[PDB]
Write a protein that binds this DNA or RNA. Structure first.
Lengths: 219, 73, 133, 163
RNA sequence: UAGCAUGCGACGCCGCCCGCCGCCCGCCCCCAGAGGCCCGUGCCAUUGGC
RNA sequence: GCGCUGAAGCGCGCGACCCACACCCGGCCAUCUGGGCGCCCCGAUGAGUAGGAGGGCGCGGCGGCCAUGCAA
RNA sequence: GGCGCGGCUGCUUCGGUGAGCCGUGCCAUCGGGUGCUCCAAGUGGGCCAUUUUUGGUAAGCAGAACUGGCGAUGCG
RNA sequence: GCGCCGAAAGGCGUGCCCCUCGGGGCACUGCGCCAACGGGCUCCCCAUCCGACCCGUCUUGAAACACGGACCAAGGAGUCUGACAUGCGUGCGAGUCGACGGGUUCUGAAACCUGGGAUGCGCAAGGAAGCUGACGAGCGGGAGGCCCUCACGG
RNA sequence: GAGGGAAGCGGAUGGGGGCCGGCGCGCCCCGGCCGUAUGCGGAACGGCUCUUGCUGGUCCGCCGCUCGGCUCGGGGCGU
C-alpha cells in the first residue's frame, strides 16, 4: 500500500508528459503508427510470431524490481567476490550459482590447461563493492581467454583495495578469516571502502559473459 | 471434391508446380507447369485476386516447393 | 499452451488404470473394466482406495486429446496418398504406417515421407522392417 | 449444494434438431434460421424453425378455407406463413389474393391459389424477399384441433366426466 | 515339569584354514527442598621448513 | 489400547493449534443460460440402485463407394 | 377493479326492484420456485431416528401420526 | 511503449487550485504490441487405507454362520409377426390404397406399365328400430402488422 | 522381484530396484542454374454480359534488347 499509492496519482503522470515530447516536435504520432511498417516476400506461412519490443520492456523492469531490495533486506554489494582470508593477497571468484544460499559455486576460466572452481558451503568468501543485475545465478563452469591472469590481476587490484580496508577496519585479520570461513551469510556491517569500481564491474560483466556462452562448448 | 474450382498438388517433370481452377459447366480446365519459386508466388497471388483468402493458396506453394526439392534429391 | 496441456494429461495421468475389480484373483475373470454392478460393492460405493470408476470428469483436455506423448497428432497411413495430407501437416502431424501395409509397399511411403518432412513413427518402423539394433 | 440448483439442471433442454430430416432440402432450411434469426428482425422465422424441427404433432395442414375466412382483408392480404403444408380442401372460388408461404403445398392448392392471385411461395424464397418477416401472419396449426387431443385408445374419449 | 528362536553363556575347539598388514569396492552417516599448531607458496586445493 | 491422578479425570473460564471431497481459489468434462463465426467463447449446477429419455463402441454377412495383401 | 351511457332480461300486485348479460367510452421480503399433452418405470412387502402418540411389564414389540435420512449417499 | 538525460530507479510540457513550507491532487492527442544450466511399465519390499471380499443375488439390513461357484475356454436368454394404441420421419392430401393377369429384362429372384382387385380408415352424425342430418358469433388473456406519433406511448 | 520375526480380501496410494523402446536465422566469397520488362508465337481463364460483345488473364515455346535473382554444398562471422 505505501509504494503502491504513488503509482496511481495521475494516472500516468510521466506517461502524460511522454506524449508531449512527440507533440512538441510537431505533428505526428497518429501517422507514424498507421503508415509503418515492413513486409513482403517471404516463404511459407501464418507468421504467428514474435518478440523483441514493448512487453519485453516491462519484463526486464519487472525482473529488476526484486533485485535492489533483496540487497536492502540482506545488505552488501553484488557479485564479484574476493578471498579476504587464506592468502593475504592472492585471487578473485564470481558467484555464478546457488545450489542454495550457503552451497555456492565460485568461478573461472580454463581453456587450454585451466583452473579449478569450487562448490562450497563456505570456505572463504566475503563481498566487495560491485553490483550487477543478477542475484546469484549464471554457471556450469566456463570462462577463459587471458583470464586466469586477468581475472586474477582484477583480483590484485581488489585485493589491494580490500587489504587497505582490512587494515583500517578489522577486528583484526584473524577473524576476518572467521567471517570469510562462514559463507551463507551475511547481514551485519556491509559497506567499508574500496573506491571506485568502473573497471572492477566491467571485469565482473565480462566474467558473467564468460560463464555464459558461446565459446568452447558447441559440439 | 470440387467447389466450383479445385487446386490439387502433384506433377512430375523434374521441378514442377500445379495450379488448377475449374469454372463453368463445359470447360473443365486443369493446368500444371512452371519452374521457379518466384513464378510459384506470382501466379497464385493473381489467383487470389480472382478468388479469395491468402492462407490456403499460399500453403499450396511450399507443398510444391518441397515436391520440386525432392525431385532433385 | 500446448506444452502445458500435453503435460497435464501425460505426467499426471490418470493412471490408476481402471481394472475390473478382483480381476487378479480369478485369471479368466477378465482385466477389462466392468462396472461394479451390485449394492455392497466397495468400489461401487465410490470409496477411495477402491480404485476409481470411469466418469466424464476423469476426461483429458481437448487440446491434448488423441495426441502421442510426443505431442504429434498421429495419422494412420495406408499408402502414399495419405502422405499428401500428412505432408501438409508435417509439423503438426506424425504418420503411422499401418501394420497391414506390406514390406514391398512400405519403402515407397517411407522415402516419400522424408521428402515431405514428416519424420515420425514411420522411421522407427522402417528400421524395424530392416532388422536391427 | 442447493437442491434448487439440481432442479435447475432438471429444466428443459428443448433444443432439438429433430432425429432426421431425411429431406436434405428441409434439413438445410431448419439450420438457416439460427444464422438469420440473430441477424435480422425476424421473430417469425425463429418460431417456424422450432416447429419444423421438433414434431409431427406440430406439423400443420392448412386448408384453403382455413386461410380463406381467416385472412379476410382486414390485415390486408399480407404474407401468410404456413409452417407445414397447405391442403386443398375448400371451394369458394377461394382466396381474395394471395402471397402464401409454406414448406410444402399440394399441387391442387398450388394451382388454385396462383389462379386466384399472388403466388404460392416457398419459405426460402420468402426468406430471400421478406428477410425482416414483418407484415406476416403466422397461420397456424393444427394438430391441436378436435381430432385427436387425448382422444386415443379405442372408442374415445370424451367430455369428461370419466373416460 | 518344560524351556537359547529372551533371538544368551561357558567349556572344550578344530583336503585346506586362519593370526597381522600393502591396495581397492558397498551400508549407518561427540563428552558435558559454559567448554574442546611456530615460518610459509598458492584464488583453491595441492604442497614444503617444524 | 499403553493407561493417568496438584491430571492424560471433572467443572468454570481462556489462548493457540490440528482437522474432510465442505468453503475458497486455479485448470479442466456434461447440460443449460446463450452469444458469436462445420467451429470457438462466457458462467451456473452437476453422487446414484430400480428406471425413463438420448449420444456412442464392438460383433457377423449384404450392397454402393474407397483401399490393403507373398507376407493377410 | 371501479364509473357512466344504452339495449335486453329476471323474480317477486298490471307490483317493486336489483342483479345478470351484452354493446360502447373513460379512469386505475421473494423472482422460473411455472401451465398443458403423449408414452413408459419399479412398484402396487420397507427401516430407522426425532417429536407427538395408542396397545403392550417390556422387547433390536406391534400399530399410527409428523418429519429427516438409510434404502438408492460418497467423503470426515 | 511510441523524444532526452539517468547504469539504476527516476524526472525533464503547461494551466488550475489547497497548503500558500516541503509538496499535493486536478486538466490537456492517436497508433501499435525475461535470466541461468544440462523416460514408461512389471513384479517386490516398506509405509498408509480400502479394508468388513468379491462378485452377484435375495433382503428393511449381506462380510455375512443367507444363496450360488473348484478353475478356465467355447456355448448360453426381448425372438417372430399380428392386432390395437402410439412416437419420430416422408410422399401425395375430402380420398388414398394396390393384389391378380398380362405385357417385358435379368434372375428360380426381382423389377417396371397398366387394368386396377380389395372397397379400409376417412369424407359426419344418431340409435332397438323407423329414418333424419346446420354452420353464424364472440369474450378475455395473449403472437403481430398498421396508424401514428416517435424519448415514452396509445 | 522377495525371502526361514513378524499377520492377511491379496487392490489402492507413495518410493527404490528389475525390464524396455526412443534419440534453425542474418551476412559475406567460390561452384551450379535461370530469368522478367518489351517485340514474337501458342494456349484452358475471368469480370461480366447472357443475340452478343468489351476490357482484363497466365504460363509455356523460345531469339533479340537492358538488367537481376534463386538453389544444393563448401568456407568465415554474428544470432
Amino acid at each position: 500500500m505505501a509504494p503502491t499509492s504513488k503509482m496511481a496519482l495521475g494516472i500516468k503522470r510521466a506517461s502524460r508528459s511522454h506524449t508531449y515530447h512527440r507533440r512538441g516536435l510537431w505533428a505526428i504520432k497518429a501517422k507514424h503508427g498507421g503508415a509503418l511498417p515492413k513486409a513482403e516476400k517471404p516463404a511459407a506461412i501464418a507468421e504467428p510470431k514474435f518478440y523483441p519490443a514493448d512487453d519485453v520492456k516491462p519484463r526486464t523492469v519487472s525482473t529488476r524490481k526484486p533485485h535492489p531490495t533483496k540487497l536492502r533486506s540482506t545488505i552488501t554489494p553484488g557479485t564479484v567476490l574476493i578471498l579476504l582470508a587464506g592468502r593475504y593477497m592472492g585471487k578473485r571468484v564470481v558467484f555464478l550459482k546457488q545450489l542454495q544460499s550457503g552451497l555456492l559455486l565460485i568461478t573461472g576460466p580454463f581453456k587450454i590447461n585451466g583452473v579449478p572452481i569450487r562448490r562450497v558451503n563456505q570456505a572463504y568468501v566475503i563481498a566487495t563493492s560491485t553490483k550487477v543485475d543478477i542475484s546469484k545465478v549464471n554457471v556450469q563452469k566456463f570462462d577463459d581467454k587471458y583470464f586466469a591472469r586477468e581475472k586474477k590481476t582484477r583480483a590484485k587490484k581488489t585485493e589491494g583495495e580490500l587489504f587497505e580496508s582490512d587494515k583500517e577496519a578489522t577486528k583484526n585479520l584473524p577473524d576476518f578469516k572467521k567471517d570469510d570461513q562462514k559463507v551463507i551469510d551475511a547481514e551485519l556491517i556491509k559497506a567499508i571502502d574500496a573506491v571506485p569500481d568502473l573497471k572492477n564491474y566491467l571485469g565482473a560483466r565480462f566474467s558473467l559473459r564468460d560463464g555464459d556462452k558461446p565459446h568452447e562448448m558447441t559440439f | 471434391v470440387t467447389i466450383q474450382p479445385s487446386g490439387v498438388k502433384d506433377a512430375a517433370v523434374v521441378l514442377s508446380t500445379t495450379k488448377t481452377k475449374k469454372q463453368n459447366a463445359p470447360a473443365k480446365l486443369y493446368h500444371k507447369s512452371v519452374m521457379r519459386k518466384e513464378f510459384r508466388k506470382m501466379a497464385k497471388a493473381v489467383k487470389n485476386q480472382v478468388s479469395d483468402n491468402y492462407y490456403r493458396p499460399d500453403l499450396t506453394k511450399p507443398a510444391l516447393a518441397r515436391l520440386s526439392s525432392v525431385y532433385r534429391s | 499452451m500446448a506444452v502445458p496441456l500435453l503435460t497435464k494429461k501425460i505426467v499426471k495421468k490418470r493412471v490408476k488404470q481402471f481394472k475390473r475389480p478382483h480381476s487378479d484373483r480369478y485369471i479368466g475373470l477378465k482385466t477389462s473394466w466392468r462396472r461394479p454392478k451390485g449394492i455392497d460393492s466397495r468400489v461401487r460405493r465410490k470409496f477411495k482406495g477402491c480404485t476409481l470408476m470411469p466418469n466424464i470428469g476423469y476426461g483429458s483436455d481437448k487440446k491434448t486429446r488423441h495426441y502421442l506423448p510426443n505431442k504429434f497428432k498421429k495419422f494412420v497411413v495406408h499408402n502414399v496418398s495419405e502422405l499428401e495430407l500428412l505432408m501438409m501437416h508435417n509439423r503438426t502431424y506424425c504418420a503411422e504406417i499401418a501394420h497391414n501395409v506390406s514390406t514391398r509397399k512400405r519403402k515407397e511411403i517411407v522415402e516419400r515421407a522424408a521428402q515431405l518432412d514428416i519424420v515420425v513413427t514411420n522411421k522407427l518402423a522402417r528400421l524395424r522392417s530392416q532388422e536391427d539394433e | 449444494m442447493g437442491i434448487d440448483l439440481v432442479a435447475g439442471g432438471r429444466n428443459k433442454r428443448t433444443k432439438r434438431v429433430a432425429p432426421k430430416s431425411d429431406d436434405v432440402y428441409l434439413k438445410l432450411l431448419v439450420k438457416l434460421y439460427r444464422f438469420l434469426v440473430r441477424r435480422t428482425k425476424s421473430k417469425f422465422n425463429a418460431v417456424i424453425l422450432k416447429r419444423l424441427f421438433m414434431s409431427k404433432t406440430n406439423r400443420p395442414p392448412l386448408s384453403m378455407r382455413r386461410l380463406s375466412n381467416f385472412m379476410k382483408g382486414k390485415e390486408e392480404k399480407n404474407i401468410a406463413v404456413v409452417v407445414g403444408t397447405i391442403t386443398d380442401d375448400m371451394r369458394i372460388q377461394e382466396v381474395p389474393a394471395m402471397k402464401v408461404t409454406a414448406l410444402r403445398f399440394t399441387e391442387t392448392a398450388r394451382a388454385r391459389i396462383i389462379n386466384a392471385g399472388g403466388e404460392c411461395l416457398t419459405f426460402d424464397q420468402l426468406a430471400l424477399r421478406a428477410p425482416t418477416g414483418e407484415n406476416t401472419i403466422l397461420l397456424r396449426g393444427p394438430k391441436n384441433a378436435r381430432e385427436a387431443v387425448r382422444h386415443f385408445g379405442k372408442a374415445p374419449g370424451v367430455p369428461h366426466s370419466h373416460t
